Amino acid sequence: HSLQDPYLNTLRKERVPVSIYLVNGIKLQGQIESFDQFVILLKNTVSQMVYKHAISTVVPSRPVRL
Template sequence: IKLQGQVDSFDQFVVLLKNSVNQMVYKHAISTIVPSRNVRLPLPDDEDGDSDD
């Protein structure tokens, strides 16, 4: 089953997925998460988050 939406919140056991409705999904039932757009992660030595220098 493919679920789509935005992670609204989470705790130790579940993730709340927000779309047209809210869905509670147990973490042990999740096998893969694919972001809908690129995710920028700052590097440890990158203070301003922009590595285009």
């Protein structure tokens, strides 16, 4: 976990609006409030929990650096 944890921590700290695409093609949007090893909390209208094993890609709205 050399890349996942720092990338998610930077996305959380910078509060960058990120778009999360699931495996079935559904597009989620919002800001990452927190995460662990298996779930990622996405905040928008409702603080919904998104499971990692269903997430395909994470697309930030602006570039970020570790």
